[PDB]
Design a protein around this ligand. Structure first.
Ligand SMILES: [K+]
Ligand SMILES: [K+]
Ligand SMILES: [K+]
Ligand SMILES: [K+]
Ligand SMILES: [K+]
Ligand SMILES: [K+]
Ligand SMILES: [K+]
Ligand SMILES: [K+]
Ligand SMILES: [K+]
Ligand SMILES: [K+]
Ligand SMILES: [Mg+2]
Ligand SMILES: [Mg+2]
Ligand SMILES: [Mg+2]
Ligand SMILES: [Mg+2]
Ligand SMILES: [Mg+2]
Ligand SMILES: [Mg+2]
Ligand SMILES: [Mg+2]
Ligand SMILES: [Mg+2]
Ligand SMILES: [Mg+2]
Ligand SMILES: [Mg+2]
Ligand SMILES: [Mg+2]
Ligand SMILES: [Mg+2]
Ligand SMILES: [Mg+2]
Ligand SMILES: [Mg+2]
Ligand SMILES: [Mg+2]
Ligand SMILES: [Mg+2]
Ligand SMILES: [Mg+2]
Ligand SMILES: [Mg+2]
Ligand SMILES: [Mg+2]
Ligand SMILES: [Mg+2]
Ligand SMILES: [Mg+2]
Ligand SMILES: [Mg+2]
Ligand SMILES: [Mg+2]
Ligand SMILES: [Mg+2]
Ligand SMILES: [Mg+2]
Ligand SMILES: [Mg+2]
Ligand SMILES: [Mg+2]
Ligand SMILES: [Mg+2]
Ligand SMILES: [Mg+2]
Ligand SMILES: [Mg+2]
Ligand SMILES: [Mg+2]
Ligand SMILES: [Mg+2]
Ligand SMILES: [Mg+2]
Ligand SMILES: [Mg+2]
Ligand SMILES: [Mg+2]
Ligand SMILES: [Mg+2]
Ligand SMILES: [Mg+2]
Ligand SMILES: [Mg+2]
Ligand SMILES: [Mg+2]
Ligand SMILES: [Mg+2]
Ligand SMILES: [Mg+2]
Ligand SMILES: [Mg+2]
Ligand SMILES: [Mg+2]
Ligand SMILES: [Mg+2]
Ligand SMILES: [Mg+2]
Ligand SMILES: [Mg+2]
Ligand SMILES: [Mg+2]
Ligand SMILES: [Mg+2]
Ligand SMILES: [Mg+2]
Ligand SMILES: [Mg+2]
Ligand SMILES: [Mg+2]
Ligand SMILES: [Mg+2]
Ligand SMILES: [Mg+2]
Ligand SMILES: [Mg+2]
Ligand SMILES: [Mg+2]
Ligand SMILES: [Mg+2]
Ligand SMILES: [Mg+2]
Ligand SMILES: [Mg+2]
Ligand SMILES: [Mg+2]
Ligand SMILES: [Mg+2]
Ligand SMILES: [Mg+2]
Ligand SMILES: [Mg+2]
Ligand SMILES: [Mg+2]
Ligand SMILES: [Mg+2]
Ligand SMILES: [Mg+2]
Ligand SMILES: [Mg+2]
Ligand SMILES: [Mg+2]
Ligand SMILES: [Mg+2]
Ligand SMILES: [Mg+2]
Ligand SMILES: [Mg+2]
Ligand SMILES: [Mg+2]
Ligand SMILES: [Mg+2]
Ligand SMILES: [Mg+2]
Ligand SMILES: [Mg+2]
Ligand SMILES: [Mg+2]
Ligand SMILES: [Mg+2]
Ligand SMILES: [Mg+2]
Ligand SMILES: [Mg+2]
Ligand SMILES: [Mg+2]
Ligand SMILES: [Mg+2]
Ligand SMILES: [Mg+2]
Ligand SMILES: [Mg+2]
Ligand SMILES: [Mg+2]
Ligand SMILES: [Mg+2]
Ligand SMILES: [Mg+2]
Ligand SMILES: [Mg+2]
Ligand SMILES: [Mg+2]
Ligand SMILES: [Mg+2]
Ligand SMILES: [Mg+2]
Ligand SMILES: [Mg+2]
Ligand SMILES: [Mg+2]
Ligand SMILES: [Zn+2]
Lengths: 138, 124, 99, 99, 83, 208
RNA sequence: GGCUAAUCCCCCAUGUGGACCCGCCCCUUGGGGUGUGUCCAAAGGGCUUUGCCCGCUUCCGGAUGGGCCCGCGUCCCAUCAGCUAGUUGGUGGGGUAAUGGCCCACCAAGGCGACGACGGGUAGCCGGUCUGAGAGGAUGGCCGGCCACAGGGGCACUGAGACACGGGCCCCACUCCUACGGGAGGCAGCAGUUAGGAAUCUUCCGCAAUGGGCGCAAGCCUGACGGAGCGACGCCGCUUGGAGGAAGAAGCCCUUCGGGGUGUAAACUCCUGAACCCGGGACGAAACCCCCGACGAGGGGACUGACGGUACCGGGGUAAUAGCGCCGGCCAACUCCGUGCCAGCAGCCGCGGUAAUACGGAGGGCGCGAGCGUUACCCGGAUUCACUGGGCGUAAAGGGCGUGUAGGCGGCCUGGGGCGUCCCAUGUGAAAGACCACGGCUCAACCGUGGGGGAGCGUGGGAUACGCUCAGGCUAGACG
RNA sequence: AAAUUU
């Protein structure tokens, strides 16, 4: 089985974007869906949608890329340059509101799971609550 | 190692072995000479170095180097030793402090006097 | 060649003989009373327990048998006497023990 | 406020006494992992009311004896011998590593 | 008993006292119960003596005993003034 | 110690014309006008490409030897500035310019900074009325630096303030020549100073 | 052996009250109230003398100080894996101000341990300090808080309080007296001696200030303390001059023999005036006390300075200590001569065997400067024990393999709880230090005032995404 | 045989 479904989804997105795939299917779960909502809201993906594989429900994440570049290696710039899970099973990371990181001095995001839902770094700072530091994306 | 292993075993702090077993952590140690011999250096060099096996008040009896041009150190000479080794002399890890209790300062020394225990010369 | 605070020492000795005396009485009387409670003689037992309580409180007046340690001794004495008399009955003189 | 813990009765072999094992979770001071420690407390059961496996609350009390400084407040939930079995297995494993 | 006295806190030849409530048994520069004022004997600043009056009245009501110097400083600060 | 000794040898070694004697660094006798090469037997020889540490050390030594301040007080002032909020370099320059001896030099009371140091040390300078004999004294914005009334009859002060007629003073300073006094208006900006020193090189030198 | 006083001890009385047994009520562990019974108080002295002052006795409360108990945290070694007989618990006692197996009888067979018992080693702990970007590492000296100890060991007495540093008893070691029977002593109080050691001070001044003990007070005591002395041991401030002064003295060192360097450096010219010499000369010190008032509030008066004729102010006034390291690279600064794997240098790489910028000396230069170097030690660089922040095909490193215990970790959906997690309020976080601002010693070091902080823990309330738990459901994992 | 690879 999967020991960390959220990190598995993040790794699926990473490996899919690294080969410039169109979309990627992740085993569906409400937590993953609430995370993908933040992803699509911030613009790191074109969006997500529920689909069905042979018998089970999945989430198709439609990835996002930049324009094709010139010179050697015309592969476009990655929209998701870096996506890393932080609060892993076996070492869980909890942060207070004054302990929320500023990712890349504002250019990135940090997805938090707080008592008021799944938020971003600025969203949780504006709400004023902390929680489990799920991952960082920039 | 996994975080669980770090909680179980934990990192191991490294202790540094002292290069100068002049006990009590002293900067210097007083001793009395036993023999004042001449030892040949290792491969890259060749000379006649002046070494003395000093019996220390720390309970040790270790060989120590005699710097300077010339010295006056007999069998019963009482001298103070300090740290600092001589690389081209295996087994010698301590120096003699010239100018202390039996060891006159190097005579006719004018460039680096404080390091060899020679007082400032007289009138200009 | 020493200081005269040895006076204190002397005083302590006196006070020692003063305290050891009082306690030595109290304990003794206590035993006596308890014996008379074990053997059923109630009037005599209570008549002696009254004097034992009196000596306890009078020793509490000074530094010999001071604060509530004296109440501890009184409580244990009266409890033991009332318990031993209940093995026989008839609390005749009606002294320290309440009705 | 007097400290109140919650644990499992793992030893009723004493008279008027139980052994309440109490667990606690906390993040490691340096490695941040939520680690689980445990400690056994000798709790006072003056009526032999609680038996093995009972999950009970424990309250800080005036000392009853050496090593015995806690009373059993109330019964949280009745006997669940799974935790007692876990503790007994963890103890029995000690006989395998001697020499 | 508990006393109101002065504690020395300035440097050598530069004395600066804290008017302070503390047990008489503890040292004069030790852990005090409360700092109720400060006193500068050399009058270096325009404010060389300040005292919390209500706190001094409280500690006198509960039974603190000021030193003669402490009582003088408190009297100069109108702690005992009942006019 | 104040390094006391030859000065224009520093005019030579630093490669930039310094003004440590006051006059005679303006006259064709500074020995920098006629001997721009560094001192020593090997002064005229072809110099090798210096290391970065060489550049930073020489720049810091230039900035320090300009004011004649010992390494102890210099490092202390630098650390003090680095503790403060704001640009380390400009605050450091404002601190150095706030020294009483340097203020005396800037107000034209002395032709050189060392002459100003001797004037202060001998009690010929007053600050807000009170006599001060400390070159390391820090002048605050608003303080009136005056000449001692008992010293206003000396020949050197007469000469110096007789030459200051018509001369201008720094934008952060005012000068009353008749009363032989002046005021420290504000801390000088980096633009106000014409020092031939790169302060970032000194910051990087102490960054090591 | 004898005489005697008292705020010395005792008896009886008075019972505001309190103590105890028993009963009742409230409260909930021994908290509070009430009834009967019983038991328990006292000391006088001084006057400005029949009126106050210092006291005394019983009780309730405050305040301060402490005893005991509990959660959590506190080094290395698993080449220490089993430990425990008052051991674990009970009953009843003794003991203390008080719980307790603290101690003792009788009874039960328990208690602890890989979440590291037991054992060995090392070590007072902390506020802090050093370092570090931080996390962390190291450390616990000065000052402040708690602890323990007083030649080694043990014990009680007195007391509100001690198992009592300058109190007592005994054993041991040591020193001294000794009529040899027996006694005296205990600097890890101040200073000082000696020993050890690389190394750490005056057998000082003073009761003036602060604080402490006794006394109504006057006052007495105080090696606490306030000062001075010695030591560049540290930090900070300052001086050994300032300005003019040659296409450039001499000497010294190079040299293409033209010259170059030491260098405006010097001698000199003018000026200021460190040292010193005089005169004045402190703040720190106004209370206790006395007088008026009322021994209150308030007002007034008087005394008192170790430092010390010191600080500081005024006048006068002399150009008047510079040293230490380094110069091959790291690393800023180069030539000559001597030496010839010799003599030696060296933190690492390394240099010297004929022409050494590395040895030694000279000239010159660089770096600091009343200091400069060396050694020792700590942190740093060191991401080189890697939480932040590392690795294991061939560089040190995957166990020879499996089964599997504890442990660690846990697919999807709904609900309850709110342990982890998060939030708000509140308490705590002593002072000093650290940070910021202003201010006092001419600045600074130093110091004062004010401000700001802050992890952690307690309490009350709230949130439920995730981790947890309980209950139910699903089939993608697993098994059949 | 040792040191130096120029
Ligand atoms: K066993
Ligand atoms: K009654
Ligand atoms: K109390
Ligand atoms: K004592
Ligand atoms: K003069
Ligand atoms: K009065
Ligand atoms: K003068
Ligand atoms: K030779
Ligand atoms: K040389
Ligand atoms: K951390
Ligand atoms: Mg927290
Ligand atoms: Mg920032
Ligand atoms: Mg903005
Ligand atoms: Mg000899
Ligand atoms: Mg006496
Ligand atoms: Mg007496
Ligand atoms: Mg008898
Ligand atoms: Mg007693
Ligand atoms: Mg539990
Ligand atoms: Mg039982
Ligand atoms: Mg019991
Ligand atoms: Mg105390
Ligand atoms: Mg005032
Ligand atoms: Mg009043
Ligand atoms: Mg700055
Ligand atoms: Mg800064
Ligand atoms: Mg007689
Ligand atoms: Mg007679
Ligand atoms: Mg009496
Ligand atoms: Mg009554
Ligand atoms: Mg009576
Ligand atoms: Mg009487
Ligand atoms: Mg009368
Ligand atoms: Mg009296
Ligand atoms: Mg308490
Ligand atoms: Mg025991
Ligand atoms: Mg018992
Ligand atoms: Mg007692
Ligand atoms: Mg045990
Ligand atoms: Mg445990
Ligand atoms: Mg120890
Ligand atoms: Mg820092
Ligand atoms: Mg710091
Ligand atoms: Mg730190
Ligand atoms: Mg420590
Ligand atoms: Mg200490
Ligand atoms: Mg201390
Ligand atoms: Mg001793
Ligand atoms: Mg002893
Ligand atoms: Mg003894
Ligand atoms: Mg007493
Ligand atoms: Mg003791
Ligand atoms: Mg004793
Ligand atoms: Mg003594
Ligand atoms: Mg004796
Ligand atoms: Mg000696
Ligand atoms: Mg001393
Ligand atoms: Mg004296
Ligand atoms: Mg005094
Ligand atoms: Mg006094
Ligand atoms: Mg002192
Ligand atoms: Mg200095
Ligand atoms: Mg000159
Ligand atoms: Mg003159
Ligand atoms: Mg005065
Ligand atoms: Mg009167
Ligand atoms: Mg008055
Ligand atoms: Mg007096
Ligand atoms: Mg005097
Ligand atoms: Mg003068
Ligand atoms: Mg170089
Ligand atoms: Mg050398
Ligand atoms: Mg070294
Ligand atoms: Mg030759
Ligand atoms: Mg040569
Ligand atoms: Mg050379
Ligand atoms: Mg030289
Ligand atoms: Mg040094
Ligand atoms: Mg190191
Ligand atoms: Mg590290
Ligand atoms: Mg680092
Ligand atoms: Mg290492
Ligand atoms: Mg790691
Ligand atoms: Mg590695
Ligand atoms: Mg290998
Ligand atoms: Mg293998
Ligand atoms: Mg398990
Ligand atoms: Mg398992
Ligand atoms: Mg789950
Ligand atoms: Mg689980
Ligand atoms: Mg739920
Ligand atoms: Mg909660
Ligand atoms: Mg603080
Ligand atoms: Mg402060
Ligand atoms: Mg100031
Ligand atoms: Mg706060
Ligand atoms: Mg809460
Ligand atoms: Mg809810
Ligand atoms: Mg289920
Ligand atoms: Mg199948
Ligand atoms: Mg060779
Ligand atoms: Zn010049």
């Amino acid at each position: 089985m999967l020991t960390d479904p959220i990190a598995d989804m993040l790794t699926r997105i990473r490996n899919a974007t690294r080969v410039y795939k169109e979309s990627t299917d992740v085993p569906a779960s409400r937590f993953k869906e609430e995370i993908l909502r933040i992803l699509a809201r911030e613009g790191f993906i074109k969006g997500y949608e529920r689909v069905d594989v042979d018998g089970k429900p999945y989430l198709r994440v439609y990835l996002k890329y930049g324009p094709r570049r010139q010179g050697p290696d015309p592969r476009p710039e990655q929209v998701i340059h870096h996506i890393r899970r932080i609060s892993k099973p076996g070492r869980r990371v909890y942060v207070g509101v004054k302990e929320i990181p500023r990712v890349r001095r504002g250019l990135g995001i940090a997805i938090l799971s707080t008592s008021k839902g799944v938020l971003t770094d600025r969203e949780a700072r504006k709400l004023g609550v902390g929680g489990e530091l799920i991952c960082e994306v920039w | 190692p996994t975080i669980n292993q770090l909680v179980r075993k934990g990192r191991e702090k490294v202790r540094k072995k002292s290069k100068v077993p002049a006990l009590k952590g002293a900067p210097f140690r007083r001793g009395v000479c036993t023999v004042v011999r001449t030892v040949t250096p290792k491969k890259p060099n060749s000379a006649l170095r002046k070494v003395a096996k000093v019996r220390l008040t720390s309970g040790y009896e270790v060989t120590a180097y005699i710097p300077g041009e010339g010295h006056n150190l007999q069998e019963h000479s009482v001298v103070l030793i300090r740290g600092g080794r001589v690389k081209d002399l295996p087994g010698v890890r301590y120096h003699i402090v010239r100018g202390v209790y039996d060891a006159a300062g190097v005579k006719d020394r004018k460039k680096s006097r404080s390091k060899y225990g020679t007082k400032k010369p007289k009138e200009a | 060649r020493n200081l005269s605070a040895l006076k204190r020492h002397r005083q302590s000795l006196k006070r020692r003989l003063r305290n050891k005396a009082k306690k030595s009485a109290i304990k003794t009387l206590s035993k006596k009373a308890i014996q008379l409670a074990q053997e059923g003689k109630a009037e005599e037992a209570l008549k002696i327990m009254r004097k034992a309580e009196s000596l306890i409180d009078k020793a509490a007046k000074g530094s010999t048998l001071h604060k509530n340690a004296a109440a501890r001794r009184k409580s244990r004495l009266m409890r033991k006497v009332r318990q031993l008399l209940e093995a026989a009955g008839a609390p005749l003189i009606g002294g320290g023990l309440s009705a | 406020p007097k400290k109140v813990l919650t644990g499992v009765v793992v030893s009723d072999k004493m008279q008027k006494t139980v052994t309440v094992l109490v667990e606690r979770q906390f993040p490691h001071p340096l490695y941040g992992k939520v680690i689980k420690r445990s400690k056994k407390y000798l709790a006072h059961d003056p009526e032999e009311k609680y038996k093995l496996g009972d999950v009970v609350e424990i309250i800080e009390s005036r000392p009853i004896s050496k090593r015995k400084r806690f009373r059993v407040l109330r019964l949280v939930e009745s006997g669940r011998m799974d935790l007692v079995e876990k503790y007994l297995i963890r103890r029995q494993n000690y006989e395998s590593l001697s020499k | 008993m508990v006393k109101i006295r002065l504690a020395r806190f300035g440097s050598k030849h530069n004395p600066h006292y804290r008017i302070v409530v503390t047990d008489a048994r503890r040292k004069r520069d030790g852990k005090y119960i409360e700092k109720i004022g400060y006193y500068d004997p050399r009058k270096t600043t325009p404010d060389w003596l300040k005292v919390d009056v209500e706190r001094a009245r409280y500690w006198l009501s509960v039974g603190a005993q000021p030193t003669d110097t402490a009582r003088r400083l408190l009297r100069q600060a109108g702690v005992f003034r009942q006019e | 110690g104040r390094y006391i000794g030859p000065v224009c040898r520093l005019c030579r070694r630093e490669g930039v014309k310094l003004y440590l004697k006051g006059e005679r660094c303006y006259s064709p006798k500074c020995a920098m006008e006629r001997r721009p090469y560094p001192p020593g037997q090997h002064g005229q020889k072809r110099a090798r490409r210096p290391s970065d540490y060489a550049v930073r050390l020489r720049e810091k030594q230039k900035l320090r030897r300009i004011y004649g301040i010992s390494e102890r007080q210099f490092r202390n002032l630098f650390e003090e500035a680095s503790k403060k909020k704001g640009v380390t370099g400009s605050v450091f320059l404002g601190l150095l310019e706030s020294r009483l001896d340097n203020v005396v030099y800037r107000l034209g009371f002395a032709v050189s900074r060392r002459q100003a140091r001797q004037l202060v040390r001998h009690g010929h300078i007053t600050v807000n009325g009170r006599r001060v004999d400390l070159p390391s004294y820090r002048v605050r914005p608003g303080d009136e630096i005056a000449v001692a009334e008992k010293s206003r009859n000396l020949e050197l002060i007469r000469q110096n303030l007789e030459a200051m007629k018509g001369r201008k003073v720094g934008p952060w300073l005012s000068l009353d020549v008749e009363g032989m006094k002046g005021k420290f208006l504000r801390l000088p900006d980096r633009e106000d100073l014409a020092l031939p020193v790169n302060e970032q090189l000194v910051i990087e030198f102490y960054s090591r």
